[PDB]
Amino acid sequence: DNSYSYGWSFYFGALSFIIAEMVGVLAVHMFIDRHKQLRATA
Amino acid sequence: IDFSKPFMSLGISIMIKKPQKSKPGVFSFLDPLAYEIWMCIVFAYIGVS
Predict the structure, then answer these.
(1) Where are its TM segments located (chain A)?
(2) The 3-state secondary structure of A1-39, one letter per residue
(3) Is B39 near chain A, with CB under 8 Å?
């Protein structure tokens, strides 16, 4: 479709991305740890 | 009308806004790519990682 600028709803969707990837890492890190506990008892 | 002999000489000439210093910015190395690409390289680097 100028001085277009971005607002806080754009930067929330950008900040949401960052928090989602970090929780994804954290959730994988918990999955790894659950399975390592199983291997330990073995 | 009548005129005396001239008291001052002149010719038509051109006036311009002499110069334009344009001191380049400190963070000007990032001009080639727009601000969106840069922010989107940081987002496409966190995803890839």
Answers:
(1) 12-32
(2) CCCCCCCHHHHHHHHHHHHHHHHHHHHHHHHHHHHHHHH
(3) yes
